[PDB]
Amino acid sequence: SKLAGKVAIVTGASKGIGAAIAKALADEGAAVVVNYASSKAGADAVVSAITEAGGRAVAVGGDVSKAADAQRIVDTAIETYGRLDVLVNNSGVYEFAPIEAITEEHYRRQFDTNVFGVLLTTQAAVKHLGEGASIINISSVVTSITPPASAVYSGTKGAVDAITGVLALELGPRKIRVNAINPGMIVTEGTHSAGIIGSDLEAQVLGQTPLGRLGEPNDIASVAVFLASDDARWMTGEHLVVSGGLN
Amino acid sequence: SKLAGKVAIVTGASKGIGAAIAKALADEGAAVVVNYASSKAGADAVVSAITEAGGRAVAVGGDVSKAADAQRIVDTAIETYGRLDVLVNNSGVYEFAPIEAITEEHYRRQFDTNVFGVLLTTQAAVKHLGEGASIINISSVVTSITPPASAVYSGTKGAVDAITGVLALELGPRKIRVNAINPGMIVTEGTHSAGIIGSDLEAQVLGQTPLGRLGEPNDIASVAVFLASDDARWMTGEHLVVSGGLN
Amino acid sequence: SKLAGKVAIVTGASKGIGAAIAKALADEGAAVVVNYASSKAGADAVVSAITEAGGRAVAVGGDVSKAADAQRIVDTAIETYGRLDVLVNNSGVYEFAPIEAITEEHYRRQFDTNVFGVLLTTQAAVKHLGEGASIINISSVVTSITPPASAVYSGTKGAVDAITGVLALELGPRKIRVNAINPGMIVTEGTHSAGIIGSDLEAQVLGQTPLGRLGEPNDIASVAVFLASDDARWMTGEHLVVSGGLN
Amino acid sequence: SKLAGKVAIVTGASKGIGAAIAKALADEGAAVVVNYASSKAGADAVVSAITEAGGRAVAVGGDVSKAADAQRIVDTAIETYGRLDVLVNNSGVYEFAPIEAITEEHYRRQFDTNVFGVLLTTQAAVKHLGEGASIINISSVVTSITPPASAVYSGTKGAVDAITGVLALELGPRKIRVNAINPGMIVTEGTHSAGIIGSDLEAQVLGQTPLGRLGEPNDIASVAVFLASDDARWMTGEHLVVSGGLN
Ligand SMILES: NC(=O)c1ccc[n+]([C@@H]2O[C@H](COP(=O)([O-])OP(=O)(O)OC[C@H]3O[C@@H](n4cnc5c(N)ncnc54)[C@H](OP(=O)(O)O)[C@@H]3O)[C@@H](O)[C@H]2O)c1
Ligand SMILES: NC(=O)c1ccc[n+]([C@@H]2O[C@H](COP(=O)([O-])OP(=O)(O)OC[C@H]3O[C@@H](n4cnc5c(N)ncnc54)[C@H](OP(=O)(O)O)[C@@H]3O)[C@@H](O)[C@H]2O)c1
Ligand SMILES: NC(=O)c1ccc[n+]([C@@H]2O[C@H](COP(=O)([O-])OP(=O)(O)OC[C@H]3O[C@@H](n4cnc5c(N)ncnc54)[C@H](OP(=O)(O)O)[C@@H]3O)[C@@H](O)[C@H]2O)c1
Ligand SMILES: NC(=O)c1ccc[n+]([C@@H]2O[C@H](COP(=O)([O-])OP(=O)(O)OC[C@H]3O[C@@H](n4cnc5c(N)ncnc54)[C@H](OP(=O)(O)O)[C@@H]3O)[C@@H](O)[C@H]2O)c1
Ligand SMILES: O=C(O)CC[C@H](CO)C(=O)O
Ligand SMILES: O=C(O)CC[C@H](CO)C(=O)O
Ligand SMILES: O=C(O)CC[C@H](CO)C(=O)O
Ligand SMILES: O=C(O)CC[C@H](CO)C(=O)O
Ligand SMILES: [Ca+2]
Ligand SMILES: [Ca+2]
Ligand SMILES: [Ca+2]
Ligand SMILES: [Ca+2]
Ligand code: NA
Ligand code: NA
Ligand code: NA
């Protein structure tokens, strides 16, 4: 197993991409801290799937944008399993608005979760990360295709791309790798809830996807396993677009 | 003259890159709104430079991260000159800190000015922008070279890069252009005050700059004039690295 | 004038983008060597346009893929005007073919002109260049959007992009700047002759162009003048996409 | 296993990166066509290492820059194993020269092998490729870092990057994936023979490598296995820099 004996944290693993990543890491032997914000039921369902398949996982509720919660998410890994090897910064929210319609709350909610939450959780985790550890930030293909009416959200993911590059260099001497995955449109709880599935944006994106379908959470999960594993030992500071060819 | 009859706003034009951009735009015929935050005297010096050279300019105090001040900056253009053609989002602050040392205040001050202030000032300006308008965002070469210990600052400029691309697509149908300049290290009031001139970072940047010197504010100002002018009429969504070849 | 007393070579200036660049450089005071391959009549017409407008120019026939012709083009600058300041590597050809249909002739004709010709002309020219010289390579937005059935042509322009970056670093110590322009679809003699204007690809590109039209040669010419001038003194190794926002 | 039942061609598998890729693909169950140009003994040793580990392989001599040899390499897969699933275009040569030292042979040798050979081998292969096939082009991090005195070699790899993007779009409807790996400096027989090991470039590269060593063939081979496998099913048109963090 590619991650035998390792411990991973996946933020926002009660739904969507994060849930798929948690299950996939556990399938390769990692014990997984499954973080949720509002959906304990979703996280418990993911933990039960992992444990019924023979793996180890534990649920932890916490808002990554709150310093004490980010710390407690990380402490859960150390207290439960004694070590930390892999951090997947997946928690994230998205809302579109044209420039005229942007409000302060629309801006702060997305930047606080999608950027400050990445920084706070990584800051808490790095004390426990040693040579060969792997930090995986879930960014978005919007940093390449920058759709209209996404200035705030695409802004958050542009920040994540740059933070990924900074920390790859900053943590290089400690041999901690830092990489991003930039998904295309993925069918998730969130893209249904946001009305993105079924929208004109979805139709446009689908038509421009070379491989001819929308993405699924497991399309991202298998790339996260790769980046978490030693097979990516010589990759750091990369941004892997996983969109079926759209960029 | 390239900008005869046009009106420009330069945020943060009491010092540094913004002051040089303001003077260069006025040299090509633009009437310039010269924004300051803490230094009225600096803005008055730039306005005096412009008017002594035969141009038109007016100072306005305002914090771009405050919605009411962003509105007052834009209203100054309309009240004084009756139109708005060019917006240069130059106001910005920088402070480095390694991941372990990042504080909430360090994060919020830079994102509020460097990202929210771009969004607020652009939001106020767009009501007045018509076909041929040009929005120029001052980003940074850090989105290319992502230096260690710059996670927050590089994050803000990654966000600006993405916002530039979004708004180029979003405002395209109105024939409003949106582009970024990504300066390398420029000798400015701010890089002196921040201790960056004389720092290890300065040494590293100089040692990797193909054209063999640090940048000066006029190195950026002449590119801003280009992007503001009809010479750049077929460029939108670009990010021009102006760093003497460092990328 | 921006290029007063300067001397420029434009390869492939009997038609299209190169003709527009030659006229624009001359409008800013440059004496221009107007190169043609098959159309002396076209180069002579561009020379007449330049001299009727008060400028200086001379035509020279030569195939940039032949070392002796590249040398003769450069010798024409030195022998006629005594110096060389600006080299625009604009000569290029394009033909689409899906992978199954690519022939050796289709491959060699495009790489010999579009790549070897850039190398040979730059190699002859660099001996005469000094501080402040500007080399401008005309690449293509296809290095961003890589359309189907363009493997050979996009291949040539990907080479040109890389050669631009190499020579920017290699000639940095001599303070010779090297930059690329990457045009979008431009209506020219060539794109009419190739049937590209009116194609389904043109409809797709137009629909994806934020500024809502196809490009024209003067859209590129004004950017070439900027890069040739001291206004771009702090830019080297850049690739300026000039496509109305398509990338 | 990840490639059970599948068949791969690795061009240039008698040495270096290609040898390591061939052995790694076979470890995951692929039958491997091991192509060599000058070194039958090297290919035979790779084939033997593969069969000793329980796999299937066959050696074939051929110059990818010769159409008849490229066709025979592909025919070897079909005649020996009946199918083709993975093509690794790894064959490549490198020689540095500053612009004034570039000769016609130096240019043609590298473009014929590194670009035309990729096109010819891919052209022969595509007839046999169906849904789920994976084409992996070995490019180079020089397309990011474009070192001085590498205009021809970096030019070839810039062409490979662009060809990768074209064919990803062109072959997307057939659900054939096309991706590139862009290695940093890898210790191989070729870098020994080229005077790269022990050069000033090796010192420059190693000092700018965040993860603190030179690369090894298996650093690339594990990424090739990922791209060949269904784990990369949602990635096409990507360029994976595998350089220990240098870009
Ligand atoms: N098409 C796409 O789906 C797409 C494309 C590109 C990038 N992305 C990125 O992929 C990531 C996941 O997207 P998704 O579509 O899977 O989202 P989703 O279905 O809406 O799931 C979001 C997950 O993040 C959690 N979360 C949200 N805010 C949080 C906070 N403050 N603290 C902790 N956890 C928080 C949610 O927790 P609860 O549900 O328990 O509250 C949930 O587990 C995000 O970073 C998103 O930006 C998605
Ligand atoms: N090497 C560099 O200098 C460098 C490199 C890359 C990018 N940049 C970017 O270039 C821009 C200018 O940098 P600089 O070095 O010229 O800076 P500077 O010398 O420190 O000048 C900063 C200017 O921004 C104004 N400003 C700051 N906060 C503001 C706020 N909240 N509202 C309105 N105006 C505000 C300042 O006003 P007062 O002084 O009146 O308070 C001043 O006019 C920034 O966006 C920076 O990130 C700089
Ligand atoms: N949409 C576009 O038009 C477009 C988009 C992106 C990039 N580009 C690039 O822009 C450049 C100009 O394109 P264009 O559309 O203006 O082409 P064009 O109208 O066909 O004109 C091509 C010019 O190049 C010259 N030329 C061709 N082969 C030559 C050779 N071997 N030696 C010397 N000169 C040679 C031609 O000379 P003669 O006519 O006298 O033989 C002519 O002056 C090319 O590099 C092209 O790849 C064009
Ligand atoms: N640092 C690096 O090593 C580095 C970095 C980035 C990219 N790359 C790329 O990685 C690839 C492999 O490099 P390497 O260092 O492993 O090279 P290497 O050790 O020199 O091995 C080259 C291989 O290519 C074969 N080859 C050469 N010309 C050929 C032709 N015309 N037809 C068929 N096969 C041919 C050789 O065959 P014979 O030996 O049997 O003649 C050999 O098997 C190349 O594409 C190179 O550009 C290498
Ligand atoms: O536009 C796309 O291709 C994906 C949009 C998706 C949901 O907003 C995201 O990037 O998070
Ligand atoms: O890294 C450089 O060369 C530039 C640093 C400069 C001041 O922090 C900035 O990007 O604002
Ligand atoms: O596809 C586009 O956007 C431009 C195509 C054009 C002619 O082939 C060129 O790149 O030279
Ligand atoms: O410059 C590097 O980091 C790698 C050089 C290597 C051999 O020339 C190549 O790209 O093929
Ligand atoms: Ca884009
Ligand atoms: Ca970089
Ligand atoms: Ca693309
Ligand atoms: Ca570079
Ligand atoms: Na304080
Ligand atoms: Na660019
Ligand atoms: Na990449």
Number of neighbouring beta carbons within 10 Å of residue D100: 10
Residue of D nearest to A170 (CA): D210
Which residue minimizes the CA distance to atom 18 of ligand 2? B190
- Cβ contact A119–B99 (<8 Å): yes
Q: Tell me how far apart the alpha carbons of residues B87 and B83 are, in angstroms, rounded to a whole number.
A: 12
Give D186's DSSP letter: B
Looking up tokens 């919660």 gives: A69
- Determine the number of helices (DSSP H) and then strands (DSSP E) in chain A: 10, 7
Q: Does the distance separating the beta carbons of D157 and C163 come in below 8 Å? A: no
Ligand 6 within 6 A of CB of B237: no
Q: Quick one: which of D195, D177, D178, D188 has its CA closest to D219?
A: D188
What residues have a C-beta under 5 A from ligand 9, the ion?
C 247
The sign of the CA dihedral A179, A183, A189, A191 is: positive
> Which residue owns the Cα nearest ligand 7 atom 5?
C185
Three-class DSSP category at D215: strand
Q: Give the span between the Cα atoms of D166 and C97, in whole angstroms.
A: 11
Q: Is B242 helix (H, G, I), strand (E, B) or coil?
A: strand
Task: Find, among D19, D33, D85, D129, the residue nearest to D229 by Cα.
Answer: D85
Residues 6+ apart with CB under 8 A from C185: C191, C196, C197, C202, C205, C206, C214, C215, C243
Question: To which residue do tokens 């920017």 refer?
Answer: C168
Which of A57, A183, A66 has the alpha carbon at shortest distance from A121?
A66
CA A192 to chain centre: 18
Evaluate whether D197 touches D55 at the Cβ level (below 8 Å): no
Distance, in Å, from the CA atom of B225 to the CA atom of B181, rounded to the nearest integer, reads 11
Strand partners, B150: B97
What is residue A55's three-state secondary structure? Answer: coil
Quick one: how far is CA D237 from the chain centroid? 15
**Which three-class secondary structure state does DSSP give residue A216?**
coil
**In whole angstroms, what is the distance from residue C94 CA to residue C110 CA?**
7
Could you tell me which chain C residue has the CA closest to the CA of D112? C108
Q: Determine the Cα–Cα distance for residues C235 and C238; give it in Å rounded to an integer.
A: 7
Which residue intervals of B40-93 are DSSP H helices? 40-52, 67-81
Q: Torsions phi, psi of C49, nearest 5?
A: -60, -40
Cβ neighbours for A43, distance < 8 A, ≥ 6 positions apart: A13, A14, A34, A35, A36, A59, A60, A61
* Cα–Cα distance, D226 to B112 (Å, whole number): 41
**Which contiguous run of DSSP H or E holds residue B85?**
none
CA pair distance A185, C30, nearest whole angstrom: 50
Tell me, in angstroms, the distance from the centre of ligand 3 to residue B19's CA: 41
Contacts of B168 in chain A (CB under 8 A): 146
Q: Which of A150, A167, A237 sits opposite B166 (nearest CB)?
A: A150
Q: Identify all chain B residues contacting C226, using CB atoms and an 8 Å cutoff.
A: 226, 231-232
- Quick check: B225 contacting C, CB < 8 Å? yes
Q: Amino acid identity of D158?
A: G
CA of A178 to the centre of ligand 1 (A): 20
DSSP B186: B
Contact B183, B215 (CB under 8 A): yes
Under DSSP, is residue C87 helix (H, G, I), strand (E, B) or coil?
Answer: strand
Residues 6+ apart with CB under 8 A from C187: C197, C214, C215, C216, C217
Using the structure block, give the residue that is written with the tokens 């590619």.
A2
Give chain C's length.
247
A14: DSSP letter: S
The vertex-D235 CA angle with B179 and C238, nearest 5°, equals 30
Amino acid at D108: R
CA–CA gap between residue A106 and residue B156 (Å, rounded): 17
Which of B179, B234, B246 to mutate: most C Cβ within 10 Å? B234
Between the alpha carbon of residue A124 and those of residues A179, B101, D42, the distances in Å are 18, 11, 50
Could you tell me which of A42, A110, A139, A122 has the C-alpha nearest to residue A86? A122
Interchain CB contact of C51 with B (< 8 Å): no
Resolution in Å, one decimal place: 1.5
Interface check B200 vs A, CB under 8 A:
no
Phi, psi of A229 (to 5 degrees): -90, 170
d(CA B195, CA D246): 28
B–C CB contacts, 8 A cutoff, strictly below: 96
Q: How far apart are alpha carbons C118 and C73 in whole angstroms?
A: 12
Structure tokens at A217: 């959470």
Mutation test of ligand 1: which of A10, A15, A64, A141 has the most ligand atoms closer than 8 Å to its C-beta?
Answer: A15
For residue D238, report the distance from its CA to the centre of ligand 15, in Å: 6
Comparing alpha-carbon positions, the chain D residue that sits nearest to A210 is D172
The candidate with the shortest Cα–Cα distance to B78, out of B27, B129, B135, B24, is B129
Distance CA D241, CA D232 (A): 15
Residue A217 C-beta-side C-alpha neighbours within 13 Å: 17
The two structure tokens encoding residue C81:
């005007």
| Separation of alpha carbons C23 and C62, rounded Å | 19
Q: How far apart are CA B232 and CA B153, in angstroms?
A: 28
Distance from CA of C22 to the nearest CA of D (A): 25
Q: What is the rounded distance in angstroms from the CA atom of residue D237 to the CA atom of residue D179? A: 5
In angstroms, the CA B154 to CA B146 distance is: 6
Name the one residue in this structure whose structure tokens are 């692929």: D30
Phi, psi angle pair for A58, to nearest 5°: -145, 140
Cβ–Cβ under 8 Å, residues C9 and C36: no
Instruction: Tell me the CA–centroid distance for residue A238 and ligand 9, in Å.
Output: 17
What one-character DSSP code corresponds to residue A89? E
Ligand 6 atom index nearest CA of B92: 11
Q: Residue D222: its chain A contacts at CB < 8 A?
A: 230-233
- Residues ≥6 apart with Cβ < 8 Å to A82: A7
Give strand pairing partners of C34: C10, C59
Indicate the burial class of B44 (C-beta count within 10 angstroms; 0-12, 13-18, 19 or more): middle
Chains in touch with A (3+ beta-carbon pairs under 8 Å) read B, D
Q: How many CB atoms lie within 10 A of CB D214?
A: 17
- Contact with chain D for residue A1, Cβ under 8 A: no
Q: Is A234 left (phi over 0), alpha (psi -120 to 50) or beta?
A: alpha
Q: What angle do CA A234, A237, A241 make, to 5 degrees?
A: 100
Dihedral sign (CA D210, D216, D220, D221): negative
Which of D84, D85, D82, D110 shows the shortest CA–CA distance to D96? Answer: D110
Tell me how far apart the alpha carbons of residues C113 and B39 are, in angstroms, rounded to a whole number. 56
Residue D239 near residue D161 (C-beta atoms within 8 A): yes
Nearest to C245 among B210, B226, B237 (CB): B237
* Breaks in chain A after (C-N > 2.5 angstroms): none
CA–CA separation, A77 vs A6, rounded Å? 11
Instruction: Write the CA distances from D185 to D140, D192, D196, integer angstroms.
Output: 9, 11, 9
Contact A125, A117 (CB under 8 A): no
Give dist(CA A234, CA A206) in Å, integer: 33
Contact partners for chain B, using 3 or more CB pairs closer than 8 A, are A, C
Angle at C150 between CA A202 and CA D165, to 5 degrees: 50
Residues near ligand 7 (Cβ within 6 A): C 94, 140-142, 147, 184-185, 191, 196, 201, 205
Residue B89 assigned ligand-binding role: no
Please list, in sequence order, all residues whose beta carbon lies within 8 angstroms of the beta carbon of residue C153, skipping any fewer than 6 positions away.
C94, C95, C96, C110, C114, C140, C142
- Per-residue b/e over C6-19, b at no fewer than 16 CB within 10 Å? bbbbbbbbbbbbbb
Residue nearest to atom 2 of ligand 7 (CA): C185
Say yes or no: D170 contacts chain C, CB-CB below 8 A. yes
**Residue A89 among known ligand-binding residues:** no
Is ligand 3 within 6 A of the CB of residue C69? no
- Looking at the DSSP assignment, which residues form a beta bridge with residue C58? C33
Pocket lining for ligand 8, CB < 6 angstroms: D 94, 140-142, 147, 184-185, 191, 196, 205
Residues around ligand 12, an ion, CB closer than 5 A = B 247
3-state helix, strand, coil in chain B (%, to 5): 50, 15, 35
CB of A24 within 8 A of CB of A218? yes
Query: CB distance from B245 to chain C under 8 Å?
Result: yes
Nearest CA to ligand 8 atom 8: D94
Query: How far does the centroid of ligand 10 lie from the alpha carbon of residue A165, in Å?
Result: 7
CA–CA dist A103, B120 (Å, integer): 9
* C135 contacts: CB under 8 Å, gap ≥ 6: C86, C87, C89, C122, C125, C129, C167, C171, C176, C177, C178, C179
Rounded CA separation D172/C149 (Å)? 12
User: Do residues D76 and D58 lie in contact, with contact meaning Cβ atoms separated by under 8 Å?
Assistant: yes
Q: With contacts defined as CB-CB under 8 Å, which chain B residues touch C236?
A: 210-211, 244-245
Spatial neighbors of D210 by CB under 8 A, at least 6 apart, are A168, A169, A172, A173, A236, A237, D244, D245, D246
Output the six-digit token pair for B239: 């990010």
Tokens (6 digits) for A166: 């900074």
Strands of A94-218, DSSP E: 134-138, 177-183
CA distance A140 to A184: 7
Tokens representing C226? 């900027």
Spatial distance between the Cα atoms of B218 and B240, rounded to a whole number of angstroms: 15
Decide: A9 in ligand 1 pocket, CB within 6 A.
Answer: no
Residues contacting residue D101 through CB under 8 Å, at least 6 positions apart = none
Best to test chain D binding among A209, A211, A222 (most D CBs inside 10 Å): A211
